């Protein structure tokens, strides 16, 4: 059996070899968006990694922690489904939400907008915004779309 | 009075011009370290921002949220105090803790280690580790000092 | 006296040793702004360098050529005056224009908006937009200010 | 219909999602070469975009502005034709020119040199030099080829 | 025939076009490792380039020079064989060395450790450590593995 | 006293915290230059470190290994003295060599050229080229100077 200090080194190095210990985080942008829009905000990489998060409604989170790697992500199905949206999809509600996010069966009154994140004309991730009561308008789409473009510039 | 959309744009742009809306996070590394050392782990930039966090003992957290900017940080006092430590300070306990972390009245019954984070021989931050019951030993310090070294490689 | 090839090599290398002989250009963004706002657009570094330019009204250009590099720039007075402006100045018209841009003598019926370009809370340049006939509104400011912010992210 | 502000935002974002709205200008280098060679100098990406320009003879420019982006470029013909040259071609004069540059109809007395720009063993671009009266010699080629090689270094 | 200056310019440029005339080196890390492990240390890219080297025992080096690129490297068979090793291989000694390194016939008394270098869960290279007399222990492995991991962070 | 594993980790980390363990080598450019010019070539940072080396005449190397690190450098006297040269110094020979390189007493028949390496208006290092029998001519200087400028661009 490897010595304890070598086993622990190996666990740290697996974490490193996977990620660089270091992740880019758009939590500050997601929070500002969340505040202005009173919304759950997810900044999701194309591979499904949650790079930024703000929860207005903590009970409604679709974030899952990878049991093995501890990395915050969307499910495999959620990850794939958002990539099928190639232009902004606004005000998804109520049963139509299940076409894209099948596990939303208590949350179908919500308005959800999905914004592709593109950098150098490539699909790099997705911005997901969702709230109760009030549909998003075009002013909200301005903010959402330029924020997504900014993420794209920072991940590119 | 500015239109609602211009007011919200200006909020987003304050977040962006400040941070971008981006940050480097060391939560995965802090989690692995916290796991293998059974410790509270804080990766704290030179200016006090908490870039990586793991809480083994959640009630003992010394993180505060900035009112105005929203960021996780140490207090000015804590921020300045950890910069006075220029080499690894291991197993700070019980009343000596108060020199560095004065708000520790109830937890002088812990072992706390402070490790400078250096990159290109410049002080970029500080790694703080704290736990109950067992003092840190030299194997623990190997893990902690190489981890701090890695953080410094990734901020630099 | 050095051979002609060596003299010419030396001149080229002076250019390379200074700059590379490379700069960053925002002409693509300045063109897109200029199109959507029907304006003359200048992206000006803090030191006075015109990094992006679009002319809707070619006759009204304030661009001058640096004697010793042919680099496009603002005059020293224009350069220093725009740095004194620390927030968006919208719809500068007609004679107040002269407080900032003193050589605007047959162009005072123009509307000019001046947007600081900030990155990481630092002043890195300025965006200047000018057009005839129609004042800028708050929607125009949204576009101007988020474009200025993007420049700040790309220079930073 | 999307609101005006949203449509303009979307135009700005297409520019950014594309290019960012940023380029890298070899105008400085082109100018230095243009000066020492008394030449029109074109630094042209593999895809035809004019990244640097100096005009000793302004009437003779082959630059066109893209109808949409307004980006300076060579025609599709000129762009594809320069990629047919895999080694330096010096002193193209006046009937061999029609094979590569067909719309040089009155400029057949000119001496034109085409130098591939190579970097990390890929063809990244082409440097085009042209002047009247004086053929280019091997000293000129030294200057031109190292300059092309440095562009190759700075795109790569 | 090209003038001599041109021909020599073209040789230099072929090196600059290829590599720049630059590599990333890990000699300083290899030297620190070789000192605290009294070992020959090889930092080897997956393609076989020797990026870092320290020789405690100069006569035993396996480094060869590529005739064309000039780069230090391992032989094709050494290169391919270390890539088959997917976990740390500790204390290769005796005849078994020959399964991995077939040219070690005068040197079978040595102990060799082979550590994969991984970066973002991809195989980027290999760390090779070798010495006489003393087997490597677990503390040696800690140092070797975290050093390998840091190479991976720096090549990634 | 700290455990052996901790003391060795601390040595490794001093190397890392310092440089990364990483550095940039100009060995490939130095080899290309020492081949075209049949010369010893040293690419030397402003602080004296040998970044690139080629030896046509191995016995005449002025490289020393740092007593502690073993890092390759010039002596402090050589390091100081090259920075007193602000323009190319060509064909330093025979007793004058000693004003700059005082330890050259068996090597006074050589021709040595010293080229400042400049990048973004700063003195970054020095290129030193040395050979028996033939003085350097202006063509040699072209190659040296442009190669120095390229090192400048790559360190900068
Ligand atoms: C990603 C699906 C939705 C938006 C999420 N469950 C929420 O309501 O926040
Ligand atoms: C930062 C001071 C100490 C470490 C902290 N309160 C803890 O026990 O986690
Ligand atoms: C810089 C001053 C103004 C904006 C400029 N002359 C123009 O009208 O385009
Ligand atoms: C690109 C073709 C030639 C070179 C160009 N029209 C010139 O004379 O400048
Ligand atoms: C790569 C094989 C071994 C390790 C090498 N010959 C040495 O003894 O250093
Ligand atoms: C740096 C001094 C001289 C150049 C060196 N000893 C050589 O002959 O290579």
Author numbering:
A (entry chain D), B (entry chain E), C (entry chain C), D (entry chain B), E (entry chain F), F (entry chain A): 1 to 156
Published text:
The GAF domain sequences of C. difficile and B. subtilis CodY proteins (44% identity) are not nearly as similar as the C-terminal, DNA-binding domains (93% identity). The crystal structure of the GAF domain of CdCodY bound to isoleucine was solved by molecular replacement and refined against data extending to 1.7 Å resolution, as described in Supplementary Materials and Methods and S1 Table. The CdCodY GAF domain was found to consist of a central, five-stranded, anti-parallel β-pleated sheet (β3-β4-β5-β1-β2) onto the bottom face of which are packed two α-helices, α2 and α4. The N-terminal α1 helix protrudes strikingly away from the rest of the GAF domain in CdCodY. Although they differ in sequence, the tertiary structure of the CdCodY GAF domain is similar to that of the GAF domain of BsCodY; 120 Cα atoms can be superposed with a root mean squared positional displacement (rmsΔ) of 1.5 Å. In both CdCodY and BsCodY, the effector isoleucine is bound in a pocket on the face of the β-sheet that is distal to the long helices α2 and α5, but the positions and modes of isoleucine binding are quite different. The CdCodY binding site is formed by residues from strands β1 and β5 from the β-pleated sheet and from the β2-β3 and β3-β4 segments of the polypeptide, which embrace the ligand so that it is completely enclosed in the protein interior. The first of the carboxylate oxygens of isoleucine forms an ion-pairing interaction with the ε-NH3+ of K110 and a charge-dipole interaction with the side chain hydroxyl of S130, with the second carboxylate oxygen forming charge-dipole hydrogen bonds with the phenolic hydroxyl of Y42 and the side chain amide–NH2 of N40. Meanwhile the α-amino group of the ligand forms an ion-pairing interaction with the side chain carboxylate of E104 and charge-dipole interactions with the hydroxyl of the side chain of S62 and the main chain carbonyl of D60. The isobutyl side chain, which distinguishes BCAAs from other amino acids, projects into a pocket circumscribed by the aromatic side chains of Y42, F74 and F101, and the aliphatic portions of the side chains of S62, S130 and E104.
CodY is found in nearly all low G+C Gram-positive bacteria and is activated by binding of one of the branched-chain amino acids (BCAAs; isoleucine, leucine, valine) and, in most species, GTP. The CodY protein represses transcription of hundreds of genes and activates transcription of dozens of other genes in many Gram-positive species. The global regulator, CodY, is also a strong repressor of the tcdR gene, as well as an inhibitor of sporulation. The cGMP-specific phosphodiesterases- adenylyl cyclases-FhlA (GAF) domain of B. subtilis CodY (BsCodY) protein, formed by the N-terminal 155 residues, includes a loop of amino acid residues that interact with BCAAs; such binding induces a change in protein structure leading to increased affinity for CodY-binding sites.
